[PDB]
Amino acid sequence: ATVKNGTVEEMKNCSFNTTTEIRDKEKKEYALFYKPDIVPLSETNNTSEYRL
Amino acid sequence: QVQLVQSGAEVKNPGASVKVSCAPSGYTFTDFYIHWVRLAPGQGLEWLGWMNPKTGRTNQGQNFQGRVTMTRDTSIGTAYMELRSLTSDDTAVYYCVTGAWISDYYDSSYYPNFDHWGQGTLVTVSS
Amino acid sequence: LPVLTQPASVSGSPGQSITISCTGTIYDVGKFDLVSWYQHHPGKAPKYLIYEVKKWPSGVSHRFSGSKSGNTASLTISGLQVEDEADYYCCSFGGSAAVVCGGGTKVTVLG
Amino acid sequence: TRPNNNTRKSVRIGPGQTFYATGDIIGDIKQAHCNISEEKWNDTLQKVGIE
Numbered sequence: 001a002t003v004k005n006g007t008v009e010e011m012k013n014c015s016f017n018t019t020t021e022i023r024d025k026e027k028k029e030y031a032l033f034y035k036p037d038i039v040p041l042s043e044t045n046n047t048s049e050y051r052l
Numbered sequence: 053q054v055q056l057v058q059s060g061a062e063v064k065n066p067g068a069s070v071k072v073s074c075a076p077s078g079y080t081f082t083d084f085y086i087h088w089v090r091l092a093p094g095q096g097l098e099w100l101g102w103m104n105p106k107t108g109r110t111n112q113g114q115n116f117q118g119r120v121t122m123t124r125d126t127s128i129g130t131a132y133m134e135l136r137s138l139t140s141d142d143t144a145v146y147y148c149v150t151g152a153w154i155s156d157y158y159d160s161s162y163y164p165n166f167d168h169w170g171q172g173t174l175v176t177v178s179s
Numbered sequence: 180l181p182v183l184t185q186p187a188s189v190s191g192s193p194g195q196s197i198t199i200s201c202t203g204t205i206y207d208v209g210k211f212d213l214v215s216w217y218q219h220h221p222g223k224a225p226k227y228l229i230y231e232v233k234k235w236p237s238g239v240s241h242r243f244s245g246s247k248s249g250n251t252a253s254l255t256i257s258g259l260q261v262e263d264e265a266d267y268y269c270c271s272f273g274g275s276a277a278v279v280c281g282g283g284t285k286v287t288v289l290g
Numbered sequence: 291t292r293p294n295n296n297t298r299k300s301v302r303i304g305p306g307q308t309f310y311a312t313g314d315i316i317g318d319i320k321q322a323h324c325n326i327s328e329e330k331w332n333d334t335l336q337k338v339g340i341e
């Protein structure tokens with residue numbers, strides 16, 4: 001969702017698989033995250049994969 | 053003073069789609085917001101959405117989510133819009149119009165100030 | 180959409196007056212001092228004649244006095260003539276992230 | 291000031307406890323910042339230099 005050349009330091013949209021209140025009914029969810037806070041999972045071409 | 057132009061009339065069946073185009077002059081294209089409005093035969097005008105020449109971020113009225121669509125380009129300096137699922141009601145004329153000044157450090161998109169207006173776009177639909 | 184109230188066609192002879200009220204809800208109209216009117220003159224596209232609730236855009240006599248009344252935007256008109264015949268809309272900020280307007284008041288000036 | 295109008299997006303995560311996160315951001319994106327008076331900060335520099 002990235003203004004490709006913006007003079008801006010926007011926060012990122014990603015998702016994740018959430019363990020609901022019952023421990024064996026997993027379900028996905030999403031929420032935004034300020035851009036410094038997340039580290040890419042890998043220094044490779046894993047441009048999708050991200051972690052806190 | 054600003055020179056503003058719209059595309060001409062258009063003909064479809066009801067429930068079809070329409071496209072509207074707009075391009076200003078007299079100011080550099082990247083400094084002002086762009087809006088659209090529908091002018092009925094006397095019923096209250098419908099404001100549809102606002103457009104940013106810089107970014108792909110736009111919002112639309114509570115009637116029009118999922119129905120309207122919009123794109124723009126910078127090098128040629130043109131604003132585009134597309135509505136789907138027309139009605140017999142929206143034979144009403146559509147007007148391109150210039151919005152408020154753009155600021156990075158405070159928000160001004162929702163300011164309801166229109167200083168320059170077009171000459172109307174009349175889409176036609178009938179049984 | 181929540182179209183605002185507007186007296187549809189009240190009018191008088193030259194030198195007479197009308198009153199206007201643009202009522203929405205408690206959430207939209209009076210949140211910011213950002214109200215605009217647009218005059219759909221017959222035979223030509225609308226025209227800009229109210230700004231910032233209490234200011235006129237260009238050089239024009241401030242006859243159509245502006246006033247803030249919270250949930251509804253109220254404005255008083257006086258000193259009209261027969262050539263003032265036109266349809267006047269009122270528009271206001273309407274929350275996340277849009278604007279709403281009224282049904283339009285026409286000055287059906289008589290005589 | 292932060293001109294973005296952030297909103298909360300609440301999820302229930304784990305038994306009997308709730309996570310909060312920034313929701314769908316309303317309005318056009320703008321950049322956060324601070325503001326300082328150029329005349330007075332320069333004068334204050336002028337007054338500090340003598341010390």
Ligand SMILES: *[C@@H]1O[C@H](CO)[C@@H](O[C@@H]2O[C@H](CO)[C@@H](O[C@@H]3O[C@H](CO[C@H]4O[C@H](CO[C@H]5O[C@H](CO)[C@@H](O)[C@H](O)[C@@H]5O[C@H]5O[C@H](CO)[C@@H](O)[C@H](O)[C@@H]5O)[C@@H](O)[C@H](O[C@H]5O[C@H](CO)[C@@H](O)[C@H](O)[C@@H]5O[C@H]5O[C@H](CO)[C@@H](O)[C@H](O)[C@@H]5O)[C@@H]4O)[C@@H](O)[C@H](O[C@H]4O[C@H](CO)[C@@H](O)[C@H](O)[C@@H]4O[C@H]4O[C@H](CO)[C@@H](O)[C@H](O)[C@@H]4O[C@H]4O[C@H](CO)[C@@H](O)[C@H](O)[C@@H]4O)[C@@H]3O)[C@H](O)[C@H]2NC(C)=O)[C@H](O)[C@H]1NC(C)=O
Pocket residue numbers: 078079080083151152153155156157158165167230231235236237291324325
């Ligand atoms: C933190 O910090 C930060 C900093 O960093 C910050 O920020 C900031 O803030 C502030 C406050 O808010 C802000 O301010 C704003 O501003 C705006 C704008 O700005 C500027 O600019 C401009 C420019 O111009 C442009 O446009 C035009 C149109 O408009 C055109 O024409 C031109 O041309 C331009 O364009 C483009 O192009 C070009 C080409 O060449 C280029 O070059 C350029 O560049 C561009 O791009 C200017 O002009 C302005 O000025 C003016 O105005 C003012 C006000 O009004 C005044 O005062 C001045 O003086 C001027 O004036 C003029 O006119 C007159 C007449 O008579 C004369 O006389 C003179 O000479 C001149 O000519 C500026 O400066 C603005 O806009 C705003 O204001 C507005 O609003 C208010 C309320 O709020 C009101 O009161 C006012 O009145 C206004 O309104 C108006 O205007 C608008 C637009 O502008 C419109 O819409 C409306 O309607 C009205 O209208 C009127 O007028 C017109 C004309 O103009 C006419 O036509 C009509 O009819 C009517 O009359 C404000 O001021 C700023 O901006 C910021 N910055 C940044 C960077 O962002 C912050 O804030 C802090 N924080 C916080 C929290 O806040």
Ligand SMILES: *[C@@H]1O[C@H](CO)[C@@H](O[C@@H]2O[C@H](CO)[C@@H](O[C@@H]3O[C@H](CO[C@H]4O[C@H](CO)[C@@H](O)[C@H](O)[C@@H]4O)[C@@H](O)[C@H](O[C@H]4O[C@H](CO)[C@@H](O)[C@H](O)[C@@H]4O[C@H]4O[C@H](CO)[C@@H](O)[C@H](O)[C@@H]4O)[C@@H]3O)[C@H](O)[C@H]2NC(C)=O)[C@H](O)[C@H]1NC(C)=O
Pocket residue numbers: 114180181203204206207273274275276295296297298316317
């Ligand atoms: C910054 O971001 C925040 C969000 O974090 C945003 O705040 C939200 O703004 C929206 C407006 O865009 C607010 O939406 C309103 O929600 C109320 C909720 O109604 C319920 O709760 C009330 C009070 O508890 C009950 O009385 C009510 O019965 C409900 O249970 C809605 O009522 C509103 O809808 C009415 O008004 C709209 C116009 O404002 C109409 O479009 C809509 O159809 C409704 O009108 C109908 O009902 C009226 C009576 O209510 C009636 O008089 C009319 O004739 C018509 O029939 C509205 O959707 C939302 O609540 C805000 N959320 C919070 C947490 O504050 C900011 O706006 C945003 N700011 C900026 C500058 O971007």
Ligand SMILES: *[C@@H]1O[C@H](CO)[C@@H](O[C@@H]2O[C@H](CO)[C@@H](O[C@@H]3O[C@H](CO)[C@@H](O)[C@H](O)[C@@H]3O)[C@H](O)[C@H]2NC(C)=O)[C@H](O)[C@H]1NC(C)=O
Pocket residue numbers: 001013014015030313314315
């Ligand atoms: C952040 O990204 C996620 C996806 O990675 C976004 O959620 C997904 O958004 C899409 C597009 O709006 C949703 O698809 C739409 O669904 C409606 C259903 O009514 C359909 O009619 C549309 O044609 C479209 O397919 C999708 O459902 C949604 N995901 C979930 C699980 O609901 C999210 O919106 C992004 N957030 C921001 C702020 O951009």
